[PDB]
Design a protein around this ligand. Sequence first.
Ligand code: MMK
Ligand code: MN
Ligand code: NI
Ligand code: ZN
Length: 454
Amino acid sequence: SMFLPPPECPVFEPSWEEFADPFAFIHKIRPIAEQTGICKVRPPPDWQPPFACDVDKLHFTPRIQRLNELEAQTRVKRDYTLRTFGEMADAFKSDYFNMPVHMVPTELVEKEFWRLVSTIEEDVTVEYGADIASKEFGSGFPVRDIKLSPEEEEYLDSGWNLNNMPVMEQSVLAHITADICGMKLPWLYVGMCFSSFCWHIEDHWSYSINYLHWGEPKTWYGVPGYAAEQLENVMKKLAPELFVSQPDLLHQLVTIMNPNTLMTHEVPVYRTNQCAGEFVITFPRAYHSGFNQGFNFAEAVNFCTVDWLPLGRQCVEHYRLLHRYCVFSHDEMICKMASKADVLDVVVASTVQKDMAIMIEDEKALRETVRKLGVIDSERMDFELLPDDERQCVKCKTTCFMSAISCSCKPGLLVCLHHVKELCSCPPYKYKLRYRYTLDDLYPMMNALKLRAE
Ligand SMILES: CCN(/C=C/N(C)C)C(=O)CNCc1cc(C(=O)O)ccn1
Ligand SMILES: [Mn+2]
Ligand code: NI
Ligand SMILES: [Zn+2]
């Protein structure tokens, strides 16, 4: 009546053989899990990585969260150690319910969270150590440096050690060297009761893998990729403030919204309580949100497989339509992988080859189009050398790589080939096509992938 819990998302309990290879396992579950957006994976009972960080020596400054439904919050933002944060978090939850922490039922915390965010008259604020870079704070998983124990060493090379997943051969980012805003490095989340993550999808519609190392559960809500635009239409009607365009990547607006509201508008929503030692996997373009039941410690990483690759291209097209900034150039990634065709995994090579064929035919059509507009002059340009802010389309903000148009009248400015008319006031003969590759350069790059693929 007040809150109706969404149905449970799928839970998988792989055997050790199934678990050994995460890419194979994630591909196998895709038919089921992509219908729910999120799923939970319980590792085999003996897979128990030991936790390595320290409670007194690592510091962080958490974000302050006002728990108000539909209120705009920025997606990324007093000093605490893990010890002092834990003391604050435990006292908060204990005092809130006047109970011991392990006695507060998860169902009650969930009901209370949704009551609390709905009520104007409540002004409950909490703190969340969110989006902490593993660079500075260190990973919860073992990494090669401190002398590691034999127990720690068993997990250095695990496929489910989140440090390794981005650099394994079946990762399409394995041979990519640009630093990509942390898409290959894990991020940490130090939670307390009611600290929350707003509704969002991942950069470039990537997967995410999320591991709860220890503490009280993390409650999730998830929506399948197929329903993403449904959800966005519901949210735009109820909170249009969130859909006004932002000046950069760091100004993304997000919010808390009751999943019953989505369910009332026929958006499918699934839930789970993720406990210590369990993974949650989010699928491409799968909206998710949630909150922590109490003091806890989680680690997550973006993840990009051969299954994701075609969706990556659709994402950048969607970003262009919305005038939203890219984290990296998808075409640049594809061309980097083509330049390493000889060392790619053969299934990766085959998949890149297919995406490259689409890229080449689209580029051919765009170049024919701008030529018909009277852009005659051209010059090769190594787009990859330019900082991102020097190669964004004036109009749609896409990061250019394959080609762009420049104008001697407006020095430094570029547009992508969809927006030739938006660059400058001057006639078309004053423009120049700047291109990374000739069409004749591209066909052999694609053939190398084909040879590798066999
Ligand atoms: C892969 C980690 N990541 C990238 C970090 N930022 C770009 C800094 C994310 O944005 C993950 N998405 C936010 C989020 C946070 C939580 C959480 O607070 O536990 C759960 C699910 N998703
Ligand atoms: Mn996320
Ligand atoms: Ni437009
Ligand atoms: Zn453009």
